[PDB]
Design a protein around this ligand. Structure first.
Ligand SMILES: CCCCCCCC/C=C\CCCCCCCC(=O)O
Ligand SMILES: CCCCCCCC/C=C\CCCCCCCC(=O)O
Ligand SMILES: CCCCCCCC/C=C\CCCCCCCC(=O)O
Ligand SMILES: CCCCCCCC/C=C\CCCCCCCC(=O)O
Ligand SMILES: CCCCCCCC/C=C\CCCCCCCC(=O)O
Ligand SMILES: [Ca+2]
Lengths: 468, 7
């Protein structure tokens, strides 16, 4: 076994104890950090502290025995120490998963999650997490020799690894796929009122002032659903309500659908078709002029199409598919069944009736919703914090869990034995998870840094009052 | 008894 001085385990356990107490004290002392996310960061801080305190205390207990077997007493103390480490490891997984649940629901169902997750409900959930993890942790140490327990912990680590892989793929690799660009899609690029922007836009296409509906995307059968909209305009054609409606259809593709759109354009007059790929700057002006944006997509994994429109006040009429279903709410748009022209025609009729009242607040809801999905926003920055925290967990626990994989799969293999002999370094990396996490919380939370700065000033006064 | 478990 690879030697590391017992004092390293004790000192790292002290540094972790000092750091994580400061984290728990800061969240409790500051009412600004009294949100479910920081409460789940608090349970994670307890779990981190308890792991390093138990590993530090265990090292003190082992060194004491090497200095002085003491029968069952040492085995009983070992089982209790290992149960606290197991319980806290399960609780740390549960806490990170709870921050993952917190972030997913604050990103998509912000108002809904906030009303549900009260200080009482989050207090119950954390208590239930720790109650189930202490029960499971004790049971896991009883059947530590059993494969089922070791396989369960390895599966739980592989779940966290799969969570890290999917979060890194979303937050960093797919960053520019679903991330809204607030520097470009800004209402500051628009001049005048929406009434005059719509008036000028409709006058440019030789049309009267009416409820303007806009389509942007490829002309294809089974993807962006231009066919659904073209069928819906034909359904609306017979209705008297269609005369108060205006349609701007942009995109290229299928000559069959291009020719269909151009045929309805010359047939109705309130229908305008641009069979050209327009510049994002002009699409932005269209989003800020039109009343509604119709996204009748059969498939749209990223709500970016709706997000871009919502930024500039355009109320989206999209399909309840992928990202559109997630981004659009009752307050921020109208959702319809994909591939249903009859339901879309009714949604355009609903939108026409909706426009008779003041849509000013509806657009403000769209703007506020689209704004919360920006990378510079508190919701996305928290998801990046979550990816860093899970990333740090996975990296710090990976050698231990590979050691655990090796323990049950290849304990006889010299290549596994050589890796398994550096177990003390893997425990040191577990100590580091409890030291790196408080450094991340401070780095990612400006408010927690401020509260930490108040404790270093109060500790200077504590030591001053201690001597005098 | 040793440091951690499954060493
Ligand atoms: C189920 C809960 C576990 C999921 C945890 C992942 C947390 C947050 C995922 C956020 C995804 C980013 C959304 C991009 C916005 C968009 O769709 O356009
Ligand atoms: C091992 C046994 C340890 C049991 C400790 C129990 C709970 C610690 C978690 C503290 C989290 C604080 C919750 C904040 C709150 O919502 O009020
Ligand atoms: C390997 C691939 C490297 C890709 C990492 C992408 C970093 C995204 C940066 C960011 O926008 O936050
Ligand atoms: C299968 C089609 C691939 C689509 C990738 C998007 C995944 C997603 O973020 O929802
Ligand atoms: C392996 C990890 C699984 C990978 C990706 C998860 C799929 C992305 C989530 C999309 C569903 C969200 C939704 O539209 O409701
Ligand atoms: Ca032990």
């Amino acid at each position: 076994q690879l030697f590391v001085s017992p004092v390293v385990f004790v000192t790292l356990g002290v540094i972790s104890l000092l750091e994580n107490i400061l984290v728990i004290v800061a969240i409790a002392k500051n009412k600004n950090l009294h949100s479910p996310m920081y409460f789940f960061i608090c349970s994670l801080a307890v779990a981190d502290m308890l792991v390093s305190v138990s590993l530090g205390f265990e090292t003190i207990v082992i060194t004491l025995l090497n200095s002085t077997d003491a029968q069952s007493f040492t085995v009983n103390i070992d089982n209790v120490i290992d149960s606290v480490i197991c319980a806290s490891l399960l609780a740390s997984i549960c806490s990170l998963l709870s921050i993952a649940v917190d972030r997913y629901f604050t990103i998509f169902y912000a108002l809904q999650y906030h009303n549900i997750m009260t200080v009482k409900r989050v207090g119950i959930i954390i208590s239930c997490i720790w109650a189930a993890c202490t029960v499971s942790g004790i049971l896991f140490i009883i059947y530590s020799d059993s494969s089922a327990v070791i396989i369960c912990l390895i599966t739980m680590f592989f779940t966290m690894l799969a969570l890290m892989a999917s979060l890194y793929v979303h937050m960093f690799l797919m960053a520019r796929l679903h991330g809204i660009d607030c520097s470009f899609w800004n209402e500051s690029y628009l001049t005048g009122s929406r009434d005059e922007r719509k008036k000028s836009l409709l006058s440019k296409f030789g049309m009267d002032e009416g409820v303007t509906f806009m389509f942007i995307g490829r002309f294809d059968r089974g993807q962006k659903g231009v066919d659904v909209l073209l069928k819906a305009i034909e359904i609306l054609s017979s209705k008297k309500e269609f005369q108060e409606m205006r349609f701007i259809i942009i995109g290229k593709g299928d000559p069959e659908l291009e020719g269909w759109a151009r045929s309805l354009e010359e047939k109705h007059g309130n229908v305008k078709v641009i069979t050209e790929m327009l510049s994002r700057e002009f699409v932005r002006e269209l989003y800020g002029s039109v009343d509604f944006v119709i996204i009748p997509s059969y498939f749209e994994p990223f709500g970016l199409v709706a997000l871009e429109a919502m930024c500039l006040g355009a109320i989206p009429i999209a399909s309840a598919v992928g990202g559109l279903r997630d981004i659009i709410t009752n307050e921020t748009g109208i959702l319809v069944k994909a591939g249903d022209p009859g339901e879309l025609a009714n949604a355009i009729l609903k939108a026409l009736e909706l426009s008779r009242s003041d849509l000013s607040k509806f657009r403000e809801n769209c703007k506020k919703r689209a704004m919360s999905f920006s990378r510079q926003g508190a919701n996305m920055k928290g998801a990046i914090t979550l990816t860093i925290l899970i990333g740090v967990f996975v990296v710090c626990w990976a050698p231990f869990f590979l050691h655990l994989i090796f323990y049950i799969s290849c304990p006889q293999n010299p290549y596994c034995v050589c890796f398994m002999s550096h177990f003390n370094l893997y425990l040191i990396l577990i100590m580091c998870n409890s030291i790196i996490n408080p450094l991340i919380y401070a780095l990612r939370s400006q408010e927690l840094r401020k509260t930490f700065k108040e404790i270093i000033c109060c500790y200077e006064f504590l030591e001053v009052l201690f001597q005098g | 008894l040793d440091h951690x478990r499954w060493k």
